Amino acid sequence: MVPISPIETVPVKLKPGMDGPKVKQWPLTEEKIKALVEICTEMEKEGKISKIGPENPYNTPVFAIWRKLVDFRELNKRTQDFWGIPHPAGLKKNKSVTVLDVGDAYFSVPLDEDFRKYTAFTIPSINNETPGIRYQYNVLPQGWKGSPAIFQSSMTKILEPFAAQNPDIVICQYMDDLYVGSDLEIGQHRTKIEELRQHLLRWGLTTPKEPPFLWMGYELHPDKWTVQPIVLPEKDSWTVNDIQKLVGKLNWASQIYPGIKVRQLSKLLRTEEAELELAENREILKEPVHGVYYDPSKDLIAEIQKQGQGQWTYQIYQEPFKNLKTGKYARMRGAHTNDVKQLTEAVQKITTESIVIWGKTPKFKLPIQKETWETWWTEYWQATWIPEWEFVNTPPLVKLWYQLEKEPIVGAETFYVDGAANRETKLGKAGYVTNKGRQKVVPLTNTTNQKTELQAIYLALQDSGLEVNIVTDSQYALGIIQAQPDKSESELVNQIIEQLIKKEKVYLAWVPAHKGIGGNEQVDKLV
Amino acid sequence: IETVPVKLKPGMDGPKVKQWPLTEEKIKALVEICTEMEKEGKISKIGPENPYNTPVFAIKKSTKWRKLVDFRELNKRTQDFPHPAGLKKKKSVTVLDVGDAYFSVPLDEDFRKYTAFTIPSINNETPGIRYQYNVLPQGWKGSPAIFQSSMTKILEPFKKQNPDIVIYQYMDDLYVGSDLEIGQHRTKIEELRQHLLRWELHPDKWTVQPIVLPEKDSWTVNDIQKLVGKLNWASQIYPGIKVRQLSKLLRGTKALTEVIPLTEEAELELAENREILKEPVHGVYYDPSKDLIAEIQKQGQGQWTYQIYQEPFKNLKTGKYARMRGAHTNDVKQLTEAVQKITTESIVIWGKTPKFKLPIQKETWETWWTEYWQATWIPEWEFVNTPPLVKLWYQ
Ligand SMILES: N#Cc1ccc2c(Oc3ccccc3OCCn3ccc(=O)[nH]c3=O)cc(F)cc2c1
Ligand SMILES: [Mg+2]
């Protein structure tokens, strides 16, 4: 007998202060008992388990479905703590790719002796007239918390030297499988696969699929990758769970499939738009498309498009018309925002995803003028940055809709504005006075201070020329306008934006309230 | 040569922290470096029985890649283990990297499991390479605390030779203050370095910035409105600020560009305000127990302002930063260098790092800050999403 290379066990402890699980054995039928007796008998013959005595207080429940089912949930709760899927678009094209799934994975790796005492289970005897049969595991049990970690660690440990000895091949390892690949000749590749199988066999690991590979919702073909076909459930009544599943499926489809919109359906989990959206989604899922694999010798490119309503879409590719992958970005929840910020966030996201998948940052093609971005980042109070990028013109283009002056405008009328409201009666007033004598006060029902100050500014914008200076005492309004939203949840703010867009020059000054500063009248709106 | 027992806080478990994605070149550098460190027994591979993980990335101080470990979580979870106030009063201070010594001291066997880290793989094609430290890791707060005695015994003759020199130690860095001349300072630093082999900051050129008001022959309405706003702001800081006579000028409705002549009461009031602002701030103390807060504002054109305080409107220090090195086109690089400088100054003055409030979105900073970061330590930070009105008041 050629001696099998020994696998060194991983020391395992329970959680501190806890003891091993003790659970009464469930009553079972006679057939179940016989089946379990036979199974445990042949398993004991193979050396996966061993028979124990009364000295072990710990008991793990067991069922039969044959096939044995040991429930270690309690042991899992009392066992200690132990230490992302690969993305197809990140894979590199190889002339040959072989899959090797090791059988009897967990049962091929030994268990730490000092922990075997806790994996003890008992087979109920017939009619309960004799003591149940006692057993304990000698290898990694199926369903035990610590099995996969120890298994994969052992696997890596055994795999290191072969990988070191063969730089001309690439080996991936997910969980219980090995994915080998090379640009060698078919015979040489198959031979090296045989060698690997021999090397694994030395340590006592048994190994045996051909393209296309059905793996983790993906379909892997030699020259390309895609997703397994998406099935959108059709029912006249859509429940919350149905919408969650539909959102999950559409998100999963959105990686390869460009233009997938999920805003409405996700908004319903807090219309004609939603129906047309899902119909367009069924329109996109009509003719399937394939993604390609990654070539390190060519530049990595990500192009972004504004999809409207806080939605963005991006394509990652190296050559035109051939995508590596795609995706989308929904804007974060906020009261105010502009296109440039959302674009920046989207870029950040794509960047992180890229570094995860390809280990590098791609060059960006963005729908924004260099000048626009320049103005933005130079005048924006926050610090902001984007990596290397160039402007591609594919409307809608991201632009700055209005810009506030840094200095007061000469020849421009000066609108001193103010607004106030009564807290309990919700009654208020808003208006302005100017240096040319122009005044206005408007009374308002159902409002607050902020709304009346905003309203005052809006009034100043409505009744003024192409160039205007505006004085306000509101830190709130100035706070909103200094954030430069191009869109807002509040209709008033949107109207003010609409006013600013029409303006040529606008200077927005601020003064402290109730300091007796002339032209600033809190007295008109207090009545 | 012998391991001193190290434990954790009363009921705090070891750090489990997600390793963030690394670029390919950094992963390569870390692989090479950690291979070399594995050959020298500095670190050793571990199994799945170790749940704990601490983040790790790669920097450049020199074209050689350096290994940086984010020991923040471990430091705050590590159990609690004499600031030379004459260090900030010195003419010059030079910082040295004495981390290379830390790897000569063995680490307590029971604590190593907490210093576990993972070199990540691209696209998750293989499991990450996990290591644990066998010696004292750089970036851990316990390392200088443990090496403190040895460092004392090493630096004893140099300190006894010329006691015009202050010596402080923080993390992997060794601060040396003196009153000498830059050339003699560099020769002294060379002699100190070769003194450590056998075994450029100017603190006096910083101050606490006063609040200044404009001096003008003629004032526009806008000028006076800004003045009144600024003085009103300053009223929160200083007791005797009054603006009623200046606001008295603004009375009526006038164009922003119209020139308004100052009265005698207005000029007097303004002068009184100047005299008040020339004084320091009343009752400003440092509390070693409380936390240091650093606020930074972007002024544009490479200009950045900052304030270190503990209580609102009670600044322990204020400063500016306009230093331009290759950062002209990049805001985030600028902010990173600024945060570093501020943290260093804070280390010199109080012997500890402050908590920052960065004028940046979390996502941007979190994505890019590790590219420009040359410092062996790391501070804590939070993000201010609302624009401060007080920006130009510090300009
Ligand atoms: N079931 C299954 C499964 C199968 C294979 C997986 C996988 O192949 C690779 C393993 C090692 C190096 C390169 C590999 O692939 C690159 C792309 N690629 C794919 C298929 C093909 O036929 N040709 C080709 O070029 C990598 C992986 F990350 C997961 C895999 C999963
Ligand atoms: Mg008001």
Swiss-Prot record, chain A:
Shown residues in whole-protein numbering: 600 to 1151 of 1447
Reported impact of I158A: 71% loss of DNA-directed DNA polymerase activity. 61% loss of RNA-directed DNA polymerase activity
Site (Cleavage): F415, Y416
Residues given in the record as Mg(2+) 2 binding sites: D418, E453, D473, D524
Effect of Y380L: No effect on RT p66/p51 heterodimerization
Upper taxonomic lineage: Viruses, Riboviria, Pararnavirae, Artverviricota, Revtraviricetes
Intracellular or extracellular location(s): Virion
Effect of V433L: In strain: Isolate PV22
Protein name (database record): Reverse transcriptase/ribonuclease H
Chain ranges of the RNase H type-1 domain: 409-527
Catalyzed reactions: Endohydrolysis of RNA in RNA/DNA hybrids. Three different cleavage modes: 1. sequence-specific internal cleavage of RNA. Human immunodeficiency virus type 1 and Moloney murine leukemia virus enzymes prefer to cleave the RNA strand one nucleotide away from the RNA-DNA junction. 2. RNA 5'-end directed cleavage 13-19 nucleotides from the RNA end. 3. DNA 3'-end directed cleavage 15-20 nucleotides away from the primer terminus; DNA(n) + a 2'-deoxyribonucleoside 5'-triphosphate = DNA(n+1) + diphosphate
Consequence of substituting H221A: Complete loss of RNA-dependent DNA polymerase activity. Complete loss of RNA 5'-end and 3'-end cleavages
Annotated consequence of substituting L178I: 29% loss of DNA-directed DNA polymerase activity. 46% loss of RNA-directed DNA polymerase activity
Result for mutant: D177E: Drastically reduced incorporation of phosphorothioate nucleotide. Loss of pyrophosphorolysis (reverse of the polymerase reaction). No effect on RNase H activity
Primary role: Multifunctional enzyme that converts the viral RNA genome into dsDNA in the cytoplasm, shortly after virus entry into the cell. This enzyme displays a DNA polymerase activity that can copy either DNA or RNA templates, and a ribonuclease H (RNase H) activity that cleaves the RNA strand of RNA-DNA heteroduplexes in a partially processive 3' to 5' endonucleasic mode. Conversion of viral genomic RNA into dsDNA requires many steps. A tRNA(3)-Lys binds to the primer-binding site (PBS) situated at the 5'-end of the viral RNA.
Reported impact of P54G: 74% loss of polymerase activity. 86% loss of RNase H activity
Mutagenesis or variant effect for G217A: Complete loss of RNA-dependent DNA polymerase activity. Complete loss of RNA 5'-end and 3'-end cleavages
Phenotypic consequence of F415L: No effect on cleavage between p51 RT and p15
Effect of Y174F: 70% loss of polymerase activity. No loss of polymerase activity
Effect of L214A: No effect on RNA-dependent DNA polymerase activity. No effect on RNA 5'-end and 3'-end cleavages
Effect of D177A: Strongly decreased RNA-directed and DNA-directed DNA polymerase activities. Loss of pyrophosphorolysis (reverse of the polymerase reaction). No effect on RNase H activity
Stated consequence of mutating Y476R: Almost no effect on RNAase H activity. Unable to replicate. Completely resistant to inhibition by BBNH
Impact noted for substituting A274L: 68% loss of polymerase activity. 10% loss of RNase H activity
Domain of life: Viruses
UniProt-annotated binding residues for Mg(2+) 1: D101, D176, D177
UniProtKB/Swiss-Prot annotation, chain B:
Motif Tryptophan repeat motif boundaries: 365-381
Record-marked site positions (Essential for RT p66/p51 heterodimerization): W368, W381
Outcome, altering M171I: 54% loss of polymerase activity according to PubMed:9533880; increases polymerase activity according to PubMed:9657675. No loss of RNase H activity
Effect seen on changing K61R: 10-fold decreased sensitivity to ddATP and ddCTP inhibitors
Effect of D173E: Drastically reduced incorporation of phosphorothioate nucleotide. Loss of pyrophosphorolysis (reverse of the polymerase reaction). No effect on RNase H activity
Effect on the protein upon substituting I154V: 70% loss of DNA-directed DNA polymerase activity. 64% loss of RNA-directed DNA polymerase activity
Consequence of substituting V176M: 27% increase of DNA-directed DNA polymerase activity. 10% loss of RNA-directed DNA polymerase activity
Phenotypic consequence of L174I: 29% loss of DNA-directed DNA polymerase activity. 46% loss of RNA-directed DNA polymerase activity
Effect of M171V: 58% loss of polymerase activity. No loss of RNase H activity
Impact after mutating W368F: No effect on RT p66/p51 heterodimerization
Result for mutant: L68V: No loss of polymerase activity. No loss of RNase H activity
Phenotype for K159R: In strain: Isolate PV22
Binding site for Mg(2+) 1: D97, D172, D173
Effect of A266L: 68% loss of polymerase activity. 10% loss of RNase H activity
Consequence the record notes for mutating L231S: 17% loss of polymerase activity. 30% loss of RNase H activity
Consequence recorded when altering P48G: 74% loss of polymerase activity. 86% loss of RNase H activity
Effect of L246S: 21% loss of polymerase activity. 16% loss of RNase H activity
Domain of life: Viruses
Annotated consequence of substituting W233T: Complete loss of polymerase activity. 87% loss of RNase H activity
Domain Reverse transcriptase: 40-201
Consequence when changing M171L: 90% loss of polymerase activity. No loss of RNase H activity
Name of this chain's protein: p51 RT
Organism per entry: Human immunodeficiency virus type 1 group M subtype B (isolate BH10) (HIV-1)
Gene (name only): gag-pol
Full protein segment contained here: 604 to 1027 of 1447
